[PDB]
Structure 1
Amino acid sequence: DEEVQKEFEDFWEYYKSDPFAGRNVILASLCPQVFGMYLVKLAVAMVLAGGIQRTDATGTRVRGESHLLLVGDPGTGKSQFLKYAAKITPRSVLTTGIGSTSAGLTVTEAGALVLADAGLCCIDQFNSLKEHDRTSIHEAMEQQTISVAKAGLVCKLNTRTTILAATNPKGQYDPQESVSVNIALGSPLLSRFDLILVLLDTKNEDWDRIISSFILENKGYPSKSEKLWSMEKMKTYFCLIRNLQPTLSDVGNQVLLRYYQMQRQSDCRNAARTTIRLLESLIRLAEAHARLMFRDTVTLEDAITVVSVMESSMQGGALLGGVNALHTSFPENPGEQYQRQCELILEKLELQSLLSEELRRLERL
């Protein structure tokens, strides 16, 4: 039907002078029952966008999806995000996790991962997921296929799912003692997860009052303007942008290619988020961020936006600094923030030859 394409084209053509206002309005409707949560509401959209699969000729093929994990103190909103993300996507199976047996996480009869082809399998309570069951998924998380020979049958099944999970920080959380110690997950497992966003509750006297007023006054959608969006519209939007095929560029790749080389050895290179499975995700996110804004050419803007999210994902040890995800709000003007971020990033990692061109582009726009 031409009506849907015409409406989306009109919406994304009106917002031409300001390109980031459209993305802000897109993000504002995700989980509109909560207040704030900028980076968290951006990472979910980036993960839900998807990726592109690239298969080699003879036998092998690389992954083309993404994964996400959330950790935070009880009473923050993880369950709301999971339940809300379980509805927009066409096909989804919601499991309890520790309440689910081995028949679901693997093959038996089709379980859960096999039953969610081209979907998204929400998982909750990942802390004590029946350690055998929690290691019987290393093969299904990275190769997208199962490979078993139980009872002498030799059966192979396909499973292409995006796993979204959230687990409590068992033991009192500490700013130091990186998640490998607090959560006590093995290094082989805690390397396939693209983003590990840490949610922390602290001392504040303004967020408390704002949240209290929000809940007490029952004021849903404090933005009383009728822009919003219905759930059918967002379902159509996230089922329609999954057909465009973006292609890389030259003003693009070099930024990621230099960032990885500089991050490989600064002084600590963490312990598990430095391997080659970082450049395989820094591309799958940059290609996903270009399918959320109705285009098929990755440019400097998409790379510069995807660098900061990954920079903030690595809690503690980093190269710019850590900002808490909870205490963030939508900026009043995103254009100035983008112009400042580009100037800040493109200095220490030396490509000043592109800063002038990007500023010239931003000028006559």
Structure 2
Amino acid sequence: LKDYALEKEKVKKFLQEFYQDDELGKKQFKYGNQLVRLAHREQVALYVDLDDVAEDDPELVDSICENARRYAKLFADAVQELLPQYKEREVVNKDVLDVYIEHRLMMEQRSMVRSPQNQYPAELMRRFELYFQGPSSNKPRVIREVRADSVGKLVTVRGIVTRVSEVKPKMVVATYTCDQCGAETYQPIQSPTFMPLIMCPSQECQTNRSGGRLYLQTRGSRFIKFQEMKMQEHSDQVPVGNIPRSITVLVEGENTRIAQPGDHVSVTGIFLPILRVVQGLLSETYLEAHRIVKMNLTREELRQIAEEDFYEKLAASIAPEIYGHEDVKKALLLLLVGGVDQSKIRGNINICLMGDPGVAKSQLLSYIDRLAPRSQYTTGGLTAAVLRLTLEGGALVLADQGVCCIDEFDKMAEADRTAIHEVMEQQTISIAKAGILTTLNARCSILAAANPAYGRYNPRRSLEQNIQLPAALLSRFDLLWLIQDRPDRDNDLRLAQHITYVHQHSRQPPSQFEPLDMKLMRRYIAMCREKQPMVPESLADYITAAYVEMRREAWASKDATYTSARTLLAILRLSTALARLRMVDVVEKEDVNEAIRLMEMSKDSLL
């Protein structure tokens, strides 16, 4: 419909004649400067913002959007023409390829009409690469929404990297030398595989009919850094009644090694088909990557925050269908806000919930998983793995900067117990399938839930007697709540009355405070994460006083209540976490004392 030569002119006009008032308003031909860098091998990639083209030709940006593979080659050939102009120094022949390119160019210039076959491919006149950066107008597209209609277009997405292969050299322009003639042969490659050439099409051997057999040479050929990765739907975009959906992404050039599993990245690139037949061909798709970037209210809200029972109301909003466990519901809220990590300190507040079956453990975890921004649910894979050769982060990795709810914690694999032990220690996961201790960042609060062996809990049987989990591993947890279903006819009647209401109403009974919508709760959390409250040194005196007091009670306590410095460290996390709930950047005695109260109650739960 349109003349690509005319488009080639427009880009050449744009690149040569686009500038931006840089820092201190410096009128600078931004791309013009980059071309000069490219001319002297000082750059390799040339990322291009389409909004710059939108600044003077939004229609061109639209045509780039409706088809991107075409315009990439147009720009690349457009830059190919411009670069010889901007050359101003004969820089050193960096790597054999440039001097090889120089050698070929002299040979070609030594030649006058010529058949199209006897000419070098554009892809070999390279060692520069070009990528686009999507316009801010184009809103990011969910991986689900990338349908077949959007193939061939340029799309921006968000997601979580589930896996990424090692860097490897992808061939681009296979080069061959004839057996018995000096003519060199080329073969650009698009498919992931190909048949290598055999017989040279060289004019001399073709005329001579000598059967000059091509022999591949890597030095003549040109490779490119390459990677293969999968990206998963970000948990926020996934509907409740579905699960995350993957998408393959291909990365090459300087975009390689800018991503790890469990990185919440945003990718701009072309969505295109690949074929490794009914009513037409069926072809698997992928997303050729261009740009990768690793991503990170009303006054009544403020009035609500000012309320003293605000945080208590929010705790009541935690699973209002669940009657009871109020102080536990408070504790879960503390985990959701997390710590501060002042400096570093473990901001995540890991909690374990051991208790008899049928006491809302599993339901609570499901609510927490639905509530947290970055959430994972598992039972025990959980940890990373090396599939076949490619990394694949487990649920623990995917919970980074979030929470991993592990139901059925009692039935974990003992190796995995060691794995989470590493996470609670340094918040990283190490693994070696081939004896290669690959360490992965795992910064994620752990919400464990276990059930005692042999039915309900026996109070006479000590801790680590009703349960068969490592006591040292248990003591690592910030809080550890023992939930017992004691037959208490009054309270039993209360819970039953709560249940019958829900059946007779499909609704919780009316409380003092109605629950808030989960999204609003998350908004409060995101506001709470905005703060990093500090600990005044005066509070330390009282804090330490409380610590030695309770530690004395542990010495007084015949059973070792696991009081330690670990106990003190968590108390710091709880206090500053409460300060975040208070939206105050300085911790307070109320926050400290309340944290001690919950700590005491968790110990009281061991009664």
Q: Give the TM-score of the pair, scaled to structure 2.
A: 0.47
Counterparts of 1:36 and 1:54 in 2: how far apart (Å)? 34
**Number of residues of Structure 1 aligned to a counterpart in Structure 2:** 300
Moved more, 259-268 or 116-125: 259-268
Which of 385, 395, 406 is equivalent to 1:123?
A: 406
1:171-320 equivalence runs, <5 A: 171=454, 172-218=456-502, 219=505, 220-223=507-510, 227-265=514-552, 266-268=555-557, 270-271=559-560, 273-315=562-604
Matched-pair contact (CA < 8 Å) for 1:107–1:114: no
Q: For residues 168-200 of structure 1, what are the alpha-carbon distances to aligned partners after superposition, in whole Å with 9 as ceiling and x for unaligned?
A: 111252223332222122232122111111111
What does the per-residue CA deviation read over 1:298-328, in whole Å, with 9 as the maximum and x for residues that have no partner? Answer: 11111111111101111477xxxx5xxxxxx
Q: Distance in 2 between matches of 1:169 and 1:253?
A: 37
Q: How does 1:1-365 map to 2 (within 5 A)?
A: 4=297, 6-13=299-306, 15=307, 19=308, 21-54=309-342, 61-97=344-380, 103-108=381-386, 109-151=392-434, 153-171=436-454, 172-218=456-502, 219=505, 220-223=507-510, 227-265=514-552, 266-268=555-557, 270-271=559-560, 273-315=562-604
Please state how far the C-alpha of 1:71 moved relative to its aligned partner.
1.4
Match of 1:339 in 2: none
User: How far is 1:152 from its partner?
Assistant: 5.0
Unmatched segments (≥5 aa) in structure 2: 1-296, 387-391
Is the 1:106–1:137 contact (alpha carbons within 8 Å) kept by the matching residues of 2? no
Provide, for residues 131-157 of structure 1, a one-character-per-residue CA deviation record: whole Å limited to 9, x for no partner.
Answer: 222223321221012334542545332
Return the structure number with greater strand share. Answer: 2
- Tell me, what secondary structure is at the counterpart of 2:580? coil
Aligned partner of residue 223 in structure 1, secondary structure: coil
Letter in 2 for 1:104: L
Task: Name which one, 1 or 2, has greater alpha-carbon Rg.
Answer: 2
Are 1:251 and 1:300, in contact at CA under 8 Å, matched by a contact in 2?
no
Is the Cα contact below 8 Å between 1:287 and 1:298 reproduced in 2?
yes
Structure 1 residue 237, shift from structure 2 partner:
1.1
Distance across 2 between alignment mates of 1:10 and 1:70: 33
Contact 1:82–1:122 under 8 Å retained in 2? yes
Larger RCO: 1 or 2 (CA < 8 Å, sep 6+): 1
Q: Compared with structure 1, are the counterparts of its residues 148 and 231 closer, same or farther at alpha carbon in structure 2 (3 Å cutoff)? A: closer
Describe the SS at the equivalent of 2:460.
coil
Q: For the residues of structure 1 that align with 2:494 and 2:410, how far apart are their CA atoms?
A: 31
Distance of 1:115 and 1:225 partners within structure 2: 37
Normalized against structure 1, the TM-score is what?
A: 0.75
Q: Aligned equivalents of 2:342 and 2:515: distance in 1?
A: 36
Q: Are the equivalent residues in 1 in contact too, given 2:561–2:603 (CA < 8 A)?
A: no
CA change 1:120–1:24 in 2 (3 A) is same
Counterpart code for 1:259: A
Partner Cα distance (2:539, 2:430) in 1: 37
Deviates more, 1:262-271 or 1:242-251: 262-271
The 1:217–1:54 alpha-carbon spacing in structure 2 relative to 1, beyond 3 Å, is closer
CA RMSD, 1 decimal: 2.3
* Separation of aligned partners in 2, 1:239 and 1:138: 28
